[PDB]
Design a protein around this motif. Structure first.
Motif, short mmCIF file in Angstrom:
data_model
loop_
_atom_site.label_atom_id
_atom_site.label_comp_id
_atom_site.label_asym_id
_atom_site.label_seq_id
_atom_site.Cartn_x
_atom_site.Cartn_y
_atom_site.Cartn_z
N UNK A 91 0.82 -1.21 0.00
CA UNK A 91 0.00 0.00 0.00
C UNK A 91 0.86 1.27 0.00
N UNK A 92 1.99 1.23 0.71
CA UNK A 92 2.89 2.38 0.75
C UNK A 92 3.56 2.61 -0.60
N UNK A 93 4.00 1.54 -1.26
CA UNK A 93 4.61 1.73 -2.57
C UNK A 93 3.56 2.11 -3.62
N UNK A 94 2.31 1.71 -3.42
CA UNK A 94 1.26 2.17 -4.32
C UNK A 94 0.96 3.65 -4.14
N UNK A 95 0.93 4.14 -2.90
CA UNK A 95 0.67 5.57 -2.72
C UNK A 95 1.86 6.42 -3.18
N UNK A 96 3.08 5.90 -3.04
CA UNK A 96 4.25 6.60 -3.58
C UNK A 96 4.20 6.68 -5.10
N UNK A 97 3.89 5.56 -5.77
CA UNK A 97 3.77 5.60 -7.22
C UNK A 97 2.53 6.33 -7.70
N UNK A 98 1.61 6.68 -6.80
CA UNK A 98 0.53 7.56 -7.19
C UNK A 98 0.93 9.03 -7.09
N UNK A 99 1.58 9.44 -5.99
CA UNK A 99 1.91 10.87 -5.97
C UNK A 99 3.14 11.20 -6.81
N UNK A 100 3.87 10.19 -7.29
CA UNK A 100 4.81 10.40 -8.39
C UNK A 100 4.11 11.00 -9.61
N UNK A 101 2.99 10.40 -10.02
CA UNK A 101 2.27 10.91 -11.17
C UNK A 101 1.60 12.24 -10.89
N UNK A 102 1.14 12.45 -9.65
CA UNK A 102 0.57 13.76 -9.29
C UNK A 102 1.63 14.86 -9.42
N UNK A 103 2.79 14.66 -8.80
CA UNK A 103 3.85 15.66 -8.86
C UNK A 103 4.57 15.68 -10.20
N UNK A 104 4.26 14.76 -11.10
CA UNK A 104 4.81 14.79 -12.44
C UNK A 104 3.90 15.53 -13.42
N UNK A 105 2.58 15.38 -13.31
CA UNK A 105 1.67 16.29 -14.02
C UNK A 105 1.80 17.73 -13.55
N UNK A 106 2.10 17.95 -12.26
CA UNK A 106 2.34 19.33 -11.83
C UNK A 106 3.61 19.94 -12.40
N UNK A 107 4.50 19.15 -13.01
CA UNK A 107 5.65 19.70 -13.70
C UNK A 107 5.26 20.35 -15.01
N UNK A 108 4.45 19.66 -15.81
CA UNK A 108 4.07 20.13 -17.13
C UNK A 108 2.85 21.02 -17.11
#
Lengths: 440, 219, 35, 184, 436, 60
Positions: free
Chosen positions: E408-425
């Motif tokens: 569950x922890x690695x799933x939430x980490x790989x989710x806010x990876x995509x959140x903070x990656x869309x916030x780049x572009x």
């Protein structure tokens, strides 16, 4: 004796070819079945058709064309249209998966399954021709096989056939509009390699033709057939001196001598002057000094480059119909008097004229009108520098963040090939200032 | 003003308002860590020498036989502190922990990943200076740590991708902060290249996967 | 000033072919002496 | 420009020890940066240019685009470091037929092509710091039949480190060369 | 020669892929018996992308249906057009998931993936040159979400260069069937970022918000929501079933919209949706298909794009149309609202045209386009997950069915990876000095 | 510019050009047609080395 073998690449190349090959069958007497009627004849001559057509024993004329494509959806209406039987079956070469709007995918992956097959069918056409003048490729820089495989035709065509003429009629992408968004990557990587391998290039972009069909013709909302009808009237009038006797006739090899100063500047502009509709045609007279002024008119040009920003390096007019050479020579001298039409100083002759007798042919279902006369023109300005420093902007914009590069690199490519091809675009922009500028 | 894809902002004269903002480059609020709680409890076998050569941690035991399974991932949780003692106790100790030891830094680098990401997920420009100096130091000092971090490039390279382009445009004027490794977009190029040197095959593919503007070395 | 009709579409026609888009018939030929 | 200078021995058009080296070179920066920082090996101040693109960030030797530095000395010597990223540099020439031709040496373009005005040659740098001593008056005698008169301008593009750009009348052995033109 | 094989996953999947085969068989003139009663010739030429041939003049779809409950296959067989499938192509388990993604993943779903792989290899062997597969599923359950990830993961290593499309009803924010669903969403977007070539995000709240306000019909049902889903999923790949003036299929959209590898979560929309009482009063033209197709009221997801920037958009059109008007409207909208469009991608919009419309109407359009309003759909699911997971709510149904707490922890980490990656572009600009 | 190895001995016997290199081993392929190109100049030094350098190059 005067053979030319058309070759059409991609969906735009096929759909240009249909409006260009319906045009030739009206122009001679060939019907869609393939054979002239023999009840009534409109072909007065004997071998006017022999530049393009080719005859079996009995009665039938099949053209020297190969309509190559990578998707079957476009070439199969050619297989069921009205001209379903004009074409020999083994010419319309088709792939199985299209190039997916990638220059790279249609260069290295998908194009190589059909580089072998067309270079057999080109051979069987070209060995038939005793006196082959030169081919004609028709493409468009946007797509993935109109940029990709059309790049890889001429790298193999040059090492096979040597010094035969290979014209291109192309589509440059338009400045503001264009359908695609990977498209400025395709157009920077193919003008690099449709450079060292080709002999002349008549760019026309689609946005300017829409501007013509709104104002000159009165067509609100044109479509892609009304654009293809006009492109056929420019191809035909270039080669009208091959098939019809004229007063001063110009072959293909006399274009290249006379509007190409150096072996990199081979991008003429284009204009066909009396584009008029049948309610505005028969009222006005269309004298030769009336239709010569409209080739130099900056709104009526066919590429979005304005000739009032640079210097004419050549000009090549082609007249048809009811034209006398004393009125060609009278109207040229008017153009040289006025100081707002700028000719480069090391070109004091400036013109190359051609007189043909046969008036242009009206097509049923078409948009134009039957006229007595027309004129084409192929100038070579330094104003084509301005539609190249725009593509350098839209290529730098994407490439400096490296968007979309993971698709092209992902099939058979290197990363520096986008950067060795930008430099040739940055090389060409300083040629068009040093050729153009005056000598002290 | 106007909002966007409406019948308004199709007017002949109307200005739009874009997207509000995004959460990148801006400094994240911090949390209470676990280094503080285990220090004020008093388990840690450390003490501080206020030498005049500098500041250095005294050690009341050896370092070659510590409990690295318990103390390595707790100093990495002290990497998110900016006050006086704690930004020093974590940083200075980690180097002495990393300098000594053989055949025990290998089975514990699975367990350090989540404090590495959680300090880099803070967008504070001074810890990013410090957490990136140890990442060069982590790779060098042991043996065969390079081959065991390659599946763990997928989780720690996202945050180094945004800040790789951070550099100074001082057109001729010399930079006096070159003593201290204070610019991070030069520190990032020092680190991503130093990840490729150790690891054999597939070290290149994973960074070019993760930092998409990458441009290989060792040709 | 203008001797011909071909001057009247060049002379002070302020319309740039590169920048003006989807323009009407009357918005091409717009001289300085109406602004 | 550079007309009344005596032009004997060596002629330096940029240095790195300087209150303002970039006086005569005009600079363009797009997705790049220029500064001055120390190098760790030679322990002396060099320059920096980087950038994602090798085509827009550059410095051009005559700041006025019309002006031409006419230098009649054959060899060109830069002192430029290896970085394993792409790097180009260009000079123009003038020949006896009063036309100006180019000599571009790019890091990647494998095969040399000779075309009317342009010649695009490869190069390969060695592993450390190095100075390049550009041969000339033979490259316009093996790619064109002409001979050498002037070198009108020089431009250097992205991703290296620059110190001491100078010209020569002859390539000298490094013991014959003066100590300020020695690398370390 | 470029066939597409259909995968229907779960009780949402079978009820979605029951209506899609009703909406495409009427498109190709197929009766409920299976036969062809057509009235043209473009209606039979490329029917072999989805159908087969049987001795006797019959066409069966290239569909495979999966379920972990045996009860839903009987419903989808006993419906109207339910007897047109070959009956050995259903695959059904004996005991269900239990709305547990874990039960569908490790415990009870992995005994049935071994059988559906044999079925999909036989169905994809017969193709001439296979183009792609589809998946239709919903991300709240334990079969469509639970084996609908483990189908995809182990089909991508056996058919890796073939196109894979997914339709995901991702969980709705405020109307919620299940109390267990944040676990099933956060553990699935992990498995679905790296695998599928395509993914469309649909929210039942947004489908309700369309049927309440645009279609204005008083009593919607799940047939009236599957109509919308099917009418979008037919229009996205009608570009290869009927010829076009300018045509662009699945690859020419997938490679032409996804800027970077991880951003393939799209927001569909469908243009001429009018109510039945206001069907006869409204004149269908291109500048109003563009108007209805481009607004925040219309999107099939529950995130409005005024809260971010369009990355790349596309709209594929159907009917007899003029390419000048089709191009000029997109030029018009893109210039006249330009802060919602990125600037390092200059001419964002992509367009294609087919010319056989859907039946009963003159012309139509669809829309898919990446916005950075899509990060709110992840930044909300992460808050439901971290609300439920701090005090360890429902974990005994998931860890005692064979897991670890750190997944569950690695799933939430790989989710806010995509959140903070869309916030780049969303915040990245053309010239890099003005960020900070 | 400074290519020519010539200098002028203002003598009391007239004027004669000194040489910093031997005349017998000059590059006559390179030097001869750029002294014939100086015949068209009339101002005092330019006309002098043009008419005087030629006569010494040809006598050796």
């Amino acid at each position: 004796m005067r053979e030319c073998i058309s070759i059409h690449v991609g969906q735009a190349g096929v759909q240009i070819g249909n409006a260009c090959w319906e045009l030739y069958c009206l122009e001679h007497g060939i019907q869609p079945d393939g054979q002239m009627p023999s009840d009534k004849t409109i072909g007065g001559g004997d071998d006017s058709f022999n530049t393009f057509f080719s005859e079996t024993g009995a009665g039938k004329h099949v053209p020297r064309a190969v309509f190559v494509d990578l998707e079957p959806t476009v070439i199969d209406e050619v297989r069921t249209g009205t001209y379903r039987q004009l074409f020999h079956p083994e010419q319309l070469i088709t792939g199985k998966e299209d190039a997916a709007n990638n220059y790279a995918r249609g260069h290295y992956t998908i194009g190589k399954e059909i580089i072998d097959l067309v270079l057999d069918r080109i051979r069987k056409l070209a060995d038939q021709c005793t006196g082959l003048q030169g081919f004609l490729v028709f493409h468009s820089f946007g797509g993935g096989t109109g940029s990709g495989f059309t790049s890889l035709l001429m790298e193999r065509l040059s090492v096979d056939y040597g010094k035969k003429s290979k014209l291109e009629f192309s589509i440059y992408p338009a400045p503001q509009v264009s359908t695609a968004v990977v498209e400025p990557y395709n157009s920077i990587l193919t003008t690099h390699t449709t450079l060292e391998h080709s002999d002349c290039a008549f760019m026309v972009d689609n946005e300017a033709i829409y501007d013509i069909c709104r104002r000159n013709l009165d067509i609100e909302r044109p479509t892609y057939t009304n654009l293809n009808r006009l492109i056929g009237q420019i191809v035909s009038s270039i080669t009208a001196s091959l098939r019809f006797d004229g007063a001063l006739n110009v072959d293909l090899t006399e274009f290249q001598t006379n509007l190409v100063p150096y072996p990199r500047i081979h991008f003429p502009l284009a204009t066909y002057a009396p584009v008029i509709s049948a309610e505005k045609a028969y009222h006005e007279q269309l004298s030769v000094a009336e239709i010569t002024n409209a080739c130099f008119e900056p709104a009526n040009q066919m590429v979005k480059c304005d000739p009032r920003h640079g210097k004419y390096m050549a000009c090549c007019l082609l007249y048809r119909g009811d034209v006398v050479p004393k009125d060609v020579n009278a109207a040229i001298a008017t153009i040289k008097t006025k100081r707002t039409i700028q000719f480069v100083d090391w070109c004091p002759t400036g013109f190359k004229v051609g007189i043909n007798y046969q008036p242009p042919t009206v097509v049923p279902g078409g948009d134009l009108a039957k006229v007595q006369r027309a004129v084409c023109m192929l100038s070579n300005t330094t104003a084509i520098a301005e539609a190249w420093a725009r593509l350098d902007h839209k290529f730098d914009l994407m490439y400096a963040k490296r968007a979309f590069v993971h698709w092209y690199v992902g099939e058979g490519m290197e990363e520096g090939e986008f950067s060795e091809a930008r430099e040739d675009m940055a090389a060409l922009e300083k040629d068009y200032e040093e050729v153009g500028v005056d000598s002290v | 003003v106007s909002e966007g894809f409406t019948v308004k902002a199709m007017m002949k004269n109307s200005v739009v308002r874009g997207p509000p903002v995004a959460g990148a480059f801006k400094e994240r609020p911090a949390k209470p860590t676990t280094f503080r709680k285990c220090y004020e409890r008093g388990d840690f076998p450390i003490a501080l020498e206020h030498d005049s050569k500098g500041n250095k941690i005294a050690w009341k035991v050896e370092i070659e036989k510590l409990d690295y399974h318990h103390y390595l991932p707790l100093f990495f949780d002290g990497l998110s502190e900016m006050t006086f003692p704690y930004e020093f106790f974590a940083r200075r100790g980690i180097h002495d922990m990393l300098e000594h030891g053989g055949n025990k830094i290998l089975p514990v680098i699975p367990q350090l990943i989540i404090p590495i990401k959680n300090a880099l997920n803070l967008r504070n420009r001074q810890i990013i200076c410090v957490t990136l100096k140890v990442l060069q130091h982590l790779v060098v000092s042991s043996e065969m740590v390079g081959e065991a971090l390659l599946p763990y490039y997928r989780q720690i390279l996202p945050i180094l991708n945004i800040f790789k382009n951070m550099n100074v445009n001082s057109g001729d004027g010399i930079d006096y902060s070159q003593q201290k490794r204070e610019n991070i977009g030069d520190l990032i190029q020092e680190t991503l290249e130093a990840f490729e040197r150790y690891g054999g095959e597939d070290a290149f593919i994973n960074i070019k996967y993760m930092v998409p503007t990458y441009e290989s070395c060792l040709l | 000033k203008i001797p011909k009709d071909d001057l009247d579409f060049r002379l002070a026609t302020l319309y740039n072919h590169h920048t003006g888009a989807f323009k009407n018939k009357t918005e091409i030929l717009l001289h300085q002496e109406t602004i | 420009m550079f007309k009344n200078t005596f032009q004997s021995g060596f002629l330096s058009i940029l240095y790195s020890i300087g209150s303002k080296p970039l006086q005569i070179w005009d600079k363009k920066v797009r997705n790049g940066h220029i500064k001055r920082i120390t190098d760790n090996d030679i322990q002396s101040l060099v320059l920096e240019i980087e950038g994602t693109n090798v085509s827009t960030t550059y410095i051009t030797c005559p700041a006025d685009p019309k002006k031409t530095l006419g230098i009649k000395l054959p060899f060109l010597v830069m002192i430029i470091k290896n970085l394993k990223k792409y790097f180009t540099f260009e000079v123009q020439v003038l020949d006896d037929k009063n036309v100006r031709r180019r000599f571009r040496a790019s890091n990647y373009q494998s095969t040399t092509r000779v075309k009317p005005f342009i010649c695009t040659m490869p190069m390969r740098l060695d592993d450390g710091w190095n100075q390049i001593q550009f041969n000339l008056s033979d490259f316009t005698r093996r790619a064109y039949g002409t001979n050498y008169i002037e070198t009108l301008r020089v431009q250097i593009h992205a991703n290296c480190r620059i110190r001491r750009v100078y010209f020569s009348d002859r390539l000298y052995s490094e013991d014959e060369l003066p100590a300020e033109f020695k690398l370390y | 020669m470029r066939e597409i094989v259909h995968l229907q996953a779960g009780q949402c999947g079978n009820q979605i892929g029951a209506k899609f085969w009703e909406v495409i068989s009427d498109e190709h003139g197929i009766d409920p018996t299976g036969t062809y009663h057509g009235d043209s010739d473009l209606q039979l030429e490329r029917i072999n992308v989805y159908y087969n041939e049987a001795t006797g003049g019959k066409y069966v779809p290239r569909a495979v249906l999966v379920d972990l409950e045996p009860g839903t296959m009987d419903s989808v067989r006993s419906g109207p057009f339910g007897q047109i499938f070959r009956p050995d192509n259903f695959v059904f388990g004996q005991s269900g998931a239990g709305n547990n993604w874990a039960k569908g993943h490790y415990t009870e779903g992995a005994e049935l993936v071994d059988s559906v792989l044999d079925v999909v290899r036989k169905e994809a062997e017969s193709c001439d040159c296979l183009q792609g597969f589809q998946l239709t599923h919903s991300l709240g359950g334990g079969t469509g979400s639970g084996m609908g990830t483990l189908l995809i993961s182990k089909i991508r290593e056996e058919y890796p260069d073939r196109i894979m499309n997914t339709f995901s009803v991702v969980p709705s924010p405020k109307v919620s069937d299940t109390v267990v669903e944040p676990y099933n969403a956060t553990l699935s977007v992990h498995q679905l970022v790296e695998n599928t070539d395509e993914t469309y995000c649909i929210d039942n709240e947004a489908l309700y918000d369309i049927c309440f306000r645009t279609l204005k019909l008083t009593t919607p049902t799940y047939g009236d929501l599957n109509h919308l889903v099917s009418a979008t999923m037919s229009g996205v790949t009608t570009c290869l079933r009927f010829p076009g003036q300018l045509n662009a299929d699945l690859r020419k959209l997938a490679v032409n919209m996804v800027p970077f590898p991880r951003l393939h979560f799209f927001m569909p929309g469908f243009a001429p949706l009018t109510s039945r009482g206001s069907q006869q009063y409204r004149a269908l033209t291109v500048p109003e298909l563009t108007q209805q197709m481009f607004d925040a009221k219309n999107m099939m997801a529950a995130c409005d794009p005024r809260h971010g920037r369009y990355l790349t958009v596309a709209a594929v059109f159907r009917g007899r149309m003029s390419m000048k008007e089709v191009d000029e409207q997109m030029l018009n909208v893109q210039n006249k609202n330009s802060s919602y469009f990125v600037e390092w991608i200059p001419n964002n919009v992509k367009t294609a045209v087919c010319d056989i419309p859907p039946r009963g109407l003159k012309m139509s359009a669809t829309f898919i386009g990446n916005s950075t309003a899509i990060q709110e759909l992840f930044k909300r699911i992460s808050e439901q997950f971290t609300a439920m997971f701090r005090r360890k709510a429902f974990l005994h149904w998931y860890t005692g069915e064979g897991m670890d707490e750190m997944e569950f922890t690695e799933a939430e980490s790989n989710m806010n990876d995509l959140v903070s990656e869309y916030q780049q572009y969303q915040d990245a600009t053309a010239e890099e000095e003005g960020e900070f």
